[PDB]
Design a protein around this nucleic acid. Structure first.
Ligand SMILES: [Mg+2]
Ligand SMILES: [Zn+2]
Lengths: 49, 194, 194, 30, 697, 49, 421
RNA sequence: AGUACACUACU
RNA sequence: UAUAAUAGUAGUGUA
């Protein structure tokens, strides 16, 4: 029968885990690719934007 | 019956009535009547091209092409900047500021007065009302000249004595000679005019 | 609408056609109509449009609409003004059905609705259903009667709240941290239960 | 002075740049 | 009905509040706006007796009670009270200033589409950008939305740079902005054009660039019609390869080879489609069993000679191919015929955008293009891919030639036809940008009508119904108006030669196949009547309101506000035009005439007079005016010519002071001015213009 | 269209208190709309008004 | 970018349960008078299956308190009253409000954008039919059961829920109908002309579309698990769904409907059609809970079309009714009303305080002067269609002066039969 | 996978 | 005199 299992949103440990996950994602994903972007949107509408 | 109904307006009648009036856009055809030309926004004044108009130290053509100094509000003209007025300089031997400035309007302007409304969200309303006699174009230009020029003089006293001192004067001839011998730049022009 | 334009064109053409032949000059009637709300031009003559290949009328009928709106707001309540500015008379088209519905008075829903109402309201409803505006001398003699009947209770109810304005202390449902915290506690309890 | 401090510095810098691209005591002497 | 009862309840609420404030000797204004179930009540109260808290509590309690007294109930959980912010239906009004969350429209830039081809999806997605632009979207974020729409379409059809269907290496173009939109290019035009003309700004902007580059210098600051007249002078030898390619596309793929520069009444861009490379979808038929009308259609199909009666009935009564029938017999036959189209039959079957999206992703490398029709657009195989289609198109246009006659045809049939296109081209050519200022107070203003002149009095459906027959008098029609509308429609048909072209095409296919192809004749008749319907189409009367830095009342003011609002994100500019942008004319007629410069003279001398008496001393005003008249020029035109225009005109009464100061008054302007200003004057002696009455008694 | 006429009409609307003169004000407003339109059309066509 | 990476790729209902309630919670916190506590206690139902949902819940919880703390940081631009129009209007652009989803300061326009945009991050069609069907059936039957059990009285005076004050209703209806029908003399002709009442039924767009409509009859052959359902349900009413245009084709082909004027056929069907059937399904919207959508048959569509058009042509004359206003013009109407209120406030305050202003050019004088107040009751109605007293509408039909007694009788008979749907 | 109010696309 | 018009399909916003 059960009930919809959801994470404890007001738990201190759960919020700390979510904050740690967001911090780790920001750490990994904020680093540059080391390559010139050169994509469709840029090359085609950079002058207008 | 039939009679030659008197014409409400006669050409000689208007010629005498406008003895006091020297307004190009305003005439009084009757004793109390007034024929006027509709108003147009001054942002289009840029579209005029012609030879310079040299009246004393003032170039009216540059005033037509000017954008900052054409505002009708008195406060926006009396509180403007020297760099804007520096465009209007065609002195070529004018001894006094007033002699050059006498070629500007002496009629009162409109000024924006702001008053509070005293409501739960407090806000102020600003409306344009005709100013008193002491607020004209000439007076606003005079105040602008004197307030901004003092800020330029106190800011170019390279010599200790002051702006009028012969040593500071000598530095001035040095600077203007440098800019005349150098290629013209809008920095150079604005400094020269100021 | 162009209905005035066509009748004016007909009148002018009829009155001028007998004169055109006498003076050996063709009289063309040109009716230029402009739609105030969607500003478009309808010139009837094709020869006049040939004469003027381009027409650039660029005007706006908004101030007149605003003035009419203010006038109608000022005189909206007065019925004599409304009949003064009314077009024609109240009129009904042909009936959509030649016979009524006799079983409506026997429907259980209608019986419940009627018995829910007091006797005078039942009589008012029965008289209002059977009221025919076309047959009656005045179309509003039914609405006015019921309005005057109910005006006493309506005025009493309005005056009761007008008096209630003085019975209110300055304590409305303002938001603050305490209420938000209690709501959050109740929410987390409900979520944990669910 | 804040209104003219930038203008004067830019004027001097551009004059230096122009005179280089082409290729105190002074006050007391005047 | 529910909203009406809600309005009655809110009126009772207004009466309660007004009586209560009358008890307090104050002033109250209540403006309730009532939708189906969303209410916006605004109350302004000025009083000195009690503080605001009691009034707020009383107003809230009365709002709840007035909602309850009429059977309704306010969701006090979602009902809130604000000093400034209004929110009626997902639309805000902060303080007299409209505000809307345009971002939602931006988020629909990658939304679903019809999935018909590279161009239709791009058009559909670009609408989310124009719709976002309408709700106060800054220029840059709208350009980002357009770019994202182009990227999404290219990714859907494998058109991104480096992919298989990239057309950059197959056309004479340096970048995909050069390739036409219908040929899988990207849109390149000002944002104001994109918002106004709606995706035709590509061809319009290309032609405007050509005009700006190749017209002579002396006719370089003139109206668009004057500059289009000088196309004959042009030298087609100097045209670049990309320009020749695009002009050939416009002359052959878009227009028809039977057009001539001498044509005086041709088709407008709204009367033709822009799709060229439309992938063909091989889809399952679907069930459609449950439909009664589909069963009847199947029975008619199985019957021998059943469909020929349907088709001949449709041909005999073609007006019900673009409109609705007036009785049951027409409606039945229309439905049975509508079953014949594959698109409608696929529409009836359940469609989810995700399945179509995945299908269009998958079926891209496969041959999906029928090049037969594309070759049929120009002079006189099977399913073909995109790349081969590009190579075939370039091979076909290589043999074709371009001449000044063809460029004249292009300019006449693309720009000179629609007054709106002429106005937009003039706005782009003659724009002058003024003082930049920050957007302080925004306002809503509706889009005006660019086609003011009207020729067809009645509705398009009635005119087509009359034209199918030859009877001006039809149910609900005025015989004289119908007669003149039919005259205009017949004149248009004979001028643009639609009937002759249709007859020639059907005759050619008759000779080719050898048997009468009735369905092709129905298709040709449908196209012809669609063109006729688009021609008459008196007014759309669409309600398009834009959020602009000011209020626009006229067409030129609206164009100026749109051009100033959509160039920079930080500020908006004041735009004025060198010459009269508007061109009075009809939708499908060439405009070879240019408007006079009277308004230029009016603006010039109003400016001179007011500038002189506002910023010049009284004594020097006359000398300044004389000097300006003698040696100045306003908007490339000498002011002396403008004064001559005003003097030699019928509007010398608006400039009485200016005329009087420079002689030229003549007493006649006095007479006209007083005659216009004259009215019936009462005192008994009632006086008016040469009419005086005096009653003694 | 002229502003002075605008305040004139606004003032005569505000001072009106009888329904017998509001009809006259409405008629005068309609005639003012036609005269504005006729004058502007004559200006556009460059013909005498 | 950290916030956007998670929201852009959120394809679950966990963020759907948070995006929509944020509007109500934060806006009620920022408002003057609001029952934010009631909304949080009884309606806010977070569904946090992911860590990002937990993070966003804390963000919303903090934003509620901050929004309460910063409702005094909203200022107004100086209104430049030209007297012919209003320029330089609105709310000042000062970055003092705290941002919600990420650290930083935002303008009030940016604050409203941050409040309201997240709702559009949701994905349509995220629901499952299996569960939403049951949820919608549960809520509909729950409301119906509550109405059956508790609600017994139709007319009251002390403002009981789901009850109407009879006298006030009748008097207000009389006044409003009088004013509206006095505004336009030819209202009946306008109803007939625009809604195409005198023309054929085939000329009406809503009767010839390809949207779904209901058919009642022994359609077991086409639908054929249905067999087990028919065998296990004695009182099973067989139904099918079809297109509107196909339904019209079937009705015309069987001579049920003719090419006579549509209004006469509508009035005849208002009697000949006694029992109305409706089915329902899920809209598939982007909210946390889906919305029930109801499909009726063709005859109900015709009668409802007649009634709705009769009401619409009167709503067009009411300045306070806004459905009749063409779309996206409601923003223009809001703007016009706002400009009127700013002008009314300015003029009334300047005129009333004229004596005090003259006296000033004093603190007691400043206190004594009248003070303006502006209030905006943005409001939603709870269960507009469910918890509504239908009987009041009878009066709107009974008091209508543009209807003949036979037309009133037929319309009221249709409404009575509709009440037994 | 409905009622209404729109706007935009394609034939 | 602020009122007559409305093809099919698809998408979007709104209640
Ligand atoms: Mg609301
Ligand atoms: Zn000098």
């Amino acid at each position: 029968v059960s009930k919809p299992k959801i994470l404890d949103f007001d738990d201190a440990n759960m919020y700390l885990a979510s904050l740690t996950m967001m911090e780790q994602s920001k750490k990994i994903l904020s680093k540059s690719n080391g390559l010139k972007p050169d994509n469709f949107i840029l090359n085609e509408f950079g002058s207008r934007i | 019956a039939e009679v030659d109904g008197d014409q409400r307006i006669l050409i000689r009648s208007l010629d005498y009535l406008n003895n006091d009036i020297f307004s190009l856009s305003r005439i009084k055809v009757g004793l109390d009547e007034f024929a006027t030309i509709k108003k147009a926004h001054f942002s289009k004044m840029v579209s005029f091209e012609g030879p310079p108009i040299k009246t004393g130290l003032l170039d009216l053509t540059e005033l037509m092409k000017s954008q900052d100094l054409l505002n009708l509000n008195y406060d926006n003209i009396r509180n403007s900047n020297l760099i804007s007025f520096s465009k209007l300089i065609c002195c070529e031997g004018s001894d006094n500021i007033n002699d050059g400035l006498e070629f500007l309007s002496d009629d009162p302007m409109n000024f924006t007065e702001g008053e509070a409304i005293h409501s739960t969200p407090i806000f102020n309303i600003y409306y344009s009302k005709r100013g008193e006699r002491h607020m004209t174009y000439r007076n606003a230009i005079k105040l602008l000249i004197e307030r901004e020029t003092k800020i330029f003089e106190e800011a170019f006293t390279f010599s200790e004595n002051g702006f009028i001192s012969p040593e500071n004067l000598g530095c001035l001839e040095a600077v203007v000679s440098l800019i005349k011998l150098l290629k013209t730049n809008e920095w150079s022009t604005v400094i020269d005019k100021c | 609408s162009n209905e005035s334009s066509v009748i004016t064109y007909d009148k002018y053409y009829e009155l001028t056609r007998d004169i055109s032949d006498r003076l050996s000059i063709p009289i063309e009637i040109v009716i230029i109509r402009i739609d105030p709300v969607s500003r478009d031009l309808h010139i009837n003559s094709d020869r006049f449009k040939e004469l003027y290949p381009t027409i650039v009328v660029d005007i706006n009928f908004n101030q007149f609409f605003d003035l009419k709106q203010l006038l109608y707001e000022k005189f909206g309540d007065d019925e004599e003004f409304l009949l003064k500015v009314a077009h024609g008379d109240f009129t009904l088209t042909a009936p959509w059905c030649k016979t009524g519905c006799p079983e409506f008075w026997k429907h259980p829903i209608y019986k419940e609705f009627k018995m829910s109402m007091p006797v005078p309201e039942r009589r008012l409803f029965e008289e209002s259903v059977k009221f025919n505006a076309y047959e009656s001398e005045r179309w509003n003699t039914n609405l006015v009667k019921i309005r005057e009947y109910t005006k006493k209770d309506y005025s009493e109810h309005i005056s009761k709240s007008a008096k209630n304005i003085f019975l209110a202390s300055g304590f409305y449902k303002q938001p603050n941290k305490n209420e938000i915290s209690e709501g959050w506690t109740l929410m987390v309890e409900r979520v944990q239960d669910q | 002075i804040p209104p003219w401090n930038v203008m004067t510095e830019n004027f001097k810098k551009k004059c230096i740049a122009l005179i280089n691209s082409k290729f105190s005591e002074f006050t007391k002497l005047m | 009905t529910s909203s009406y009862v809600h309005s009655c309840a809110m009126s009772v609420y207004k009466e309660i509040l007004k009586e209560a404030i009358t008890l307090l000797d104050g002033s109250i204004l209540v403006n309730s706006l009532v939708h189906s179930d969303d209410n916006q009540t605004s109350i302004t109260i000025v009083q000195d007796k009690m503080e605001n808290d009691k009034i707020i509590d009383f107003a809230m309690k009365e709002f709840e009670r007035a909602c309850l007294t009429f059977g309704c109930q306010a969701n006090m959980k979602k009902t809130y009270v604000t000093n400034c912010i209004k929110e009626f239906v997902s639309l805000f009004n902060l303080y007299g200033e409209p505000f809307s969350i345009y971002g939602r429209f931006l988020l629909t830039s990658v939304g679903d589409c019809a999935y018909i081809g590279p161009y239709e999806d791009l058009a559909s997605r670009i609408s989310s950008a124009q719709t976002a632009i309408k709700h106060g979207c800054p220029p840059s974020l709208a350009w980002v939305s357009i770019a994202i729409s182009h990227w999404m379409t290219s990714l859907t059809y494998n058109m991104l740079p480096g992919q298989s269907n990239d057309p950059i290496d197959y056309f004479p173009a340096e970048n995909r902005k050069d390739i036409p939109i219908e040929l899988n290019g990207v849109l390149d035009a000002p944002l104001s054009m994109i918002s106004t003309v709606g995706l035709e700004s590509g061809n319009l902007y290309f032609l405007i660039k050509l005009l700006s580059k190749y017209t002579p210098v002396m006719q370089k600051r003139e109206s668009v019609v004057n500059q289009i007249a000088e196309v004959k002078n042009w030298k087609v030898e100097d045209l670049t390869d990309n320009e020749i390619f695009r002009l050939k596309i416009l002359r052959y793929l878009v227009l028809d080879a039977e057009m001539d520069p001498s044509d005086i009444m041709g088709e407008t861009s709204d009367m033709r489609g822009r799709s060229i490379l439309t992938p063909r979808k091989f889809t399952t038929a679907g069930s459609l069993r449950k439909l009664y009308s589909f069963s009847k259609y199947q029975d008619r199909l199985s019957s021998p000679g059943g469909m020929v009666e349907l088709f001949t009935y449709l041909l005999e009564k073609p007006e019900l191919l673009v409109t609705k029938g007036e009785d049951m017999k027409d409606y039945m036959e229309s439905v049975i015929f509508r079953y014949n189209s594959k698109r409608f039959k696929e529409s009836l079957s359940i469609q989810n955008p995700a399945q179509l999206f995945i299908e269009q992703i998958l079926f891209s490398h496969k041959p999906v293009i029928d090049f037969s029709g594309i070759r049929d657009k120009y002079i006189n195989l099977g399913k073909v891919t995109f790349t081969e289609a590009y190579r075939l198109l370039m091979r076909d246009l290589s043999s074709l030639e371009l001449t000044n006659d063809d460029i004249q045809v292009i300019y006449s049939y693309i720009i000179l036809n629609d007054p709106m296109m002429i106005t937009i081209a003039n706005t782009h050519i003659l724009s002058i940008y003024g003082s930049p200022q920050r957007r302080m107070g925004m306002s809503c203003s509706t889009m005006p009508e660019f086609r003011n002149l009207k020729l067809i009095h009645h509705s398009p459906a009635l005119v087509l119904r009359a034209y199918s027959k030859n009877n001006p008098d039809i149910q609900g029609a005025d015989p004289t108006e119908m007669a003149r509308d039919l005259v205009h429609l017949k004149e248009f048909v004979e001028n643009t030669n639609l009937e002759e072209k249709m007859k020639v095409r059907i005759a050619m296919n008759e000779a080719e196949k050898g048997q009468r192809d009735i369905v092709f004749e129905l298709k040709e008749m449908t196209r012809f009547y669609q063109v006729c319907y688009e021609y008459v189409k008196s007014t759309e009367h669409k309600i398009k309101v834009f959020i602009l830095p000011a209020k626009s009342y006229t067409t030129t003011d609206f164009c100026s506000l749109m051009q100033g609002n959509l160039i920079k994100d930080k500020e908006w500019y004041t735009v004025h035009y060198l010459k009269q942008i508007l061109s009075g004319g009809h939708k499908a007629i060439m405009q070879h005439n240019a408007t006079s410069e009277q308004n230029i003279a009016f603006e010039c001398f109003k400016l001179i007079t007011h500038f002189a008496d506002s910023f010049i001393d009284s004594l020097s005003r006359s000398a300044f005016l004389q000097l300006i008249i003698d040696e100045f020029s306003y908007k490339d035109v000498k002011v002396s010519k403008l004064y001559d225009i005003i003097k030699n005109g019928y509007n010398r009464t608006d400039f009485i002071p200016l005329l009087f100061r420079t002689g030229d008054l003549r007493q006649a302007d006095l007479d006209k001015y007083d005659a216009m200003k004259s009215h019936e004057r009462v005192t008994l002696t009632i006086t008016g213009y040469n009419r005086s009455i005096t009653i003694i008694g | 269209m002229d502003y002075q006429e605008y305040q004139q009409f606004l003032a005569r609307i505000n001072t009106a208190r009888d329904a017998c003169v509001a009809k006259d004000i409405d008629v005068d407003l309609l005639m003012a709309r036609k005269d504005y339109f006729g004058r502007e059309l004559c200006k556009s066509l460059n013909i005498e008004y | 970018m950290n916030f956007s990476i998670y929201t852009s790729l959120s394809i679950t209902k966990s963020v759907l349960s948070l995006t929509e309630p944020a509007r109500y919670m934060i806006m009620n916190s920022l408002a003057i008078s609001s029952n934010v506590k009631d909304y949080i206690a009884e309606k806010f139902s977070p569904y946090t299956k992911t860590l990002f949902s937990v993070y966003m819940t804390r963000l919303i919880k903090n934003a509620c308190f901050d929004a309460y703390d910063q409702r005094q940081r909203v200022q107004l631009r100086d209104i430049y009253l030209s007297d012919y129009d209003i320029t330089q209007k609105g709310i000042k652009d000062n970055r003092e409000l705290t941002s919600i989803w990420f650290p930083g300061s935002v303008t009030l326009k940016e604050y409203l954008t941050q409040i309201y945009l997240p709702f559009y991050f949701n994905a349509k069609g995220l629901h499952e039919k299996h569960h939403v069907m049951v949820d919608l059936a549960k809520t509909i039957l729950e409301i119906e059961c509550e109405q059956r059990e508790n609600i017994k009285e139709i007319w009251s005076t002390n403002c009981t829920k789901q009850t109407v004050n009879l006298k006030i209703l009748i008097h207000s209806l009389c006044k409003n109908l009088l004013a509206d029908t006095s505004r336009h003399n030819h209202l009946r002709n306008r109803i007939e002309n625009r809604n195409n009442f005198r023309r054929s039924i085939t000329t009406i767009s809503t009767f010839t579309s390809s949207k779904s409509c209901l058919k009642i009859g022994d359609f077991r052959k086409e639908k054929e698990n249905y067999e087990m359902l028919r065998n296990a349900m004695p009182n099973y009413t067989d139904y099918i769904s079809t297109k509107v245009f196909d339904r019209l084709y079937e009705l015309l082909d069987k001579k049920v409907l003719t090419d006579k004027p549509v209004i006469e056929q509508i009035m005849d069907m208002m009697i000949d059609h006694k029992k109305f059937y409706f089915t329902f399904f899920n809209k598939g919207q982007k909210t946390s809970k889906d919305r029930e959508i109801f499909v009726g048959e063709y005859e109900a569509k015709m009668c409802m079309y007649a009634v709705e058009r009769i009401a619409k042509e009167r709503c067009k004359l009411n300045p306070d009714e806004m459905i009749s206003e063409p779309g996206d013009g409601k923003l223009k109407v809001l703007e016009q009303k706002s400009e009127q209120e700013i002008r009314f406030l300015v003029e009334t305050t300047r005129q009333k305080n004229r004596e005090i202003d003259e006296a000033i050019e004093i603190e007691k004088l400043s206190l004594g002067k009248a003070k303006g107040l502006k209030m905006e009751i943005n409001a939603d109605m709870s269960k507009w269609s469910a918890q509504d007293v239908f009987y009041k509408y009878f009066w709107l039909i009974a008091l209508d002066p543009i209807l003949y007694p036979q037309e009133k009788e037929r319309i009221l008979y249709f409404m009575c039969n509709y009440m037994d749907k």
